[PDB]
Amino acid sequence: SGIFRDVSLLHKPTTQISDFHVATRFNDDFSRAVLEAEVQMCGELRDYLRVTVSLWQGETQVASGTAPFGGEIIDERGGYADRVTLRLNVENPKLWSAEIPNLYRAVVELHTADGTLIEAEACDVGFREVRIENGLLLLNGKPLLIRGVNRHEHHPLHGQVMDEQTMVQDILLMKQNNFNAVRCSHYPNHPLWYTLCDRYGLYVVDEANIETHGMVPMNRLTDDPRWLPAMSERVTRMVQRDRNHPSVIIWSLGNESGHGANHDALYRWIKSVDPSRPVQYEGGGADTTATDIICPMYARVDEDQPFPAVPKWSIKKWLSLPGETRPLILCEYAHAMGNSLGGFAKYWQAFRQYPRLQGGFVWDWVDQSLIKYDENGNPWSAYGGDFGDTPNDRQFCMNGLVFADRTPH
Amino acid sequence: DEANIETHGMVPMNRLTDDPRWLPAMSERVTRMVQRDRNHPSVIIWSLGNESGHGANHDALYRWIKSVDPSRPVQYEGGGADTTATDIICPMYARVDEDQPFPAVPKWSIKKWLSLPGETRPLILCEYAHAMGNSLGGFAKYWQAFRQYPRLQGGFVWDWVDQSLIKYDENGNPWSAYGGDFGDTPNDRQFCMNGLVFADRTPH
Ligand code: NA
Ligand code: NA
Ligand code: NA
Ligand code: NA
């Protein structure tokens, strides 16, 4: 517990940019793109107000557009007078991917017609298209093969406080170890994380802070309308916050919370607000109506585990169940707990032979061990119960590929 | 029930079946079969023939049956086992886990075949586990797979009886003959014996 992430103060003018959405759409071969920027304001509405959205490639400005507020007509009562959408044509754009994290800089200026800048907000932009077609998850028209890992925000000394140093470090080891994607298990991460992924180049699964595993049954709350409000905010605010990061390629509804009507609602909400990205969720069986990807945890390659209500089929069999057509990406697989990862190659071989097996996210990145001190001030690695904490689940918080200090297993 | 159409030796295999001038002769072989056997309950699937590649003639005829006898599915393995002239993915000799990615007409692992992007048909091998001489090694692997995957709905082993023919020696005693034993040539020797039982019906 505590004030574990940054605290700050921000000054905005009275007439301000209260929101902005950045989208990139492409032509059949990506040789041409349209960057669309929706900008919203708070402040007195005035005729002389303008928005200028400019696109830069390094120190080169590649595109720009300016316009007064007042969106198009949308219904019988009109349109959003406090909004406006800029559309910028980009030819032969340099595309973003984890292999080549090309980025552009988008600068949104709020200013007077005549020139006076009120404020400017900005972001990095990755031109890329994420889309599921014919059962495959494509990136820029090509099928991804996910080399992922789940990663909590954990630090042996600091606990749940995340610093750039550590983040950078995690990123590099992952890249140096052939990983191309990471899952935010199981909550939106510290802001800087997304920026780093954008820049170094990693595919990200951004996940809502919603986990009700201890319930009985698991969907006790998620299936209850009375909890829909609290849940919705865990989803909506995430989306509103991270929708412009190119690194984020999929949204996730949370984790281990069974499957409830609430998930369905929320799933549709997202699809509605941001069609640019697929939505997945593993709860209730991993192939529910609330997920665009079959995303099981721990399904085996060849071996079926027919649990009731929520079987975990052999991943290869799962794909060809009658009527099934989705891609399969394990949200969790290969539990790296201790002396583990036996049978890892087996998964890879399957991922390589079957087109719709587009990989998965190993469970997980780093051991959740906390440093303690002995009678003579020497530090040692602690786990559940080592703090008088009980009930506890002992070493089960230690399942990483690397030790808490980042030394590899 | 399978129309009497096989043009295996053409180069490429669909040389005639893709020719509209052969449509007619081909049509009769399909139509007259349906016309004749359409009342037998035992017939559950129609087959367009065998090893004649994949040509337009097959699409037209596939359509003819569907039209005239919606009661039964039509299958055809030529041209790749999963062409638009077949309701059933019905490959010959596709392996359980092992891909054989021949160009133009690959034979994927059956388990893999079912879930290729956009694929939804059931799969029943029109030919499998080639029973020539001391064979059938790996038969169990298929059974396990068929049992495990709903869409893997079995197949037809190749084949039931050895095509040996009886000949006699000076002594007047009978012997089982094969390819070339009659002075025939060119011939394919023992290739005509792929059965589960010998010609006299004695099991292998
Ligand atoms: Na694959
Ligand atoms: Na754990
Ligand atoms: Na089956
Ligand atoms: Na033969």
Detailed description of the structure:
This is part of a larger assembly, with two copies of chain A. Chain A is of the alpha/beta class. Chain A is built from six helices and 19 strands. Chain A has two domains: 115 residues, Sandwich (Immunoglobulin-like), CATH 2.60.40.10; 281 residues, Glycosidases (TIM Barrel). In chain A, the strands form five sheets. In chain A, strands 15-14-13-12-11-17-16 form a seven-stranded parallel beta sheet. In chain A, strands 4-3-6-7 form a four-stranded antiparallel beta sheet, with no helix packed on it. A three-stranded antiparallel beta sheet of chain A has the order 1-2-5, with no helix packed on it. Chain A is globular and about 65 Å long. The two termini of chain A are 29 Å apart.
SSE inventory with pairings:
This is part of a larger assembly, with two copies of chain A.
Chain A: E1 16-26, E2 32-42, E3 49-57, E4 60-67, E5 83-91, E6 104-112, E7 117-125, E8 130-133, E9 136-139, E10 142-143, E11 146-150, H1 164-176, E12 181-183, H2 191-201, E13 203-207, H3 228-242, E14 248-252, H4 261-273, E15 279-280, H5 315-319, E16 328-333, H6 344-353, E17 357-362, E18 370-373, E19 379-382
Parallel strand pairs in A: 11-12, 11-17, 12-13, 13-14, 14-15, 16-17
Antiparallel strand pairs in A: 1-2, 2-5, 3-4, 3-6, 6-7, 8-9, 9-10, 18-19
Helix pairs in contact in A: 1-2, 3-4
The structure holds sodium ion (4 copies).
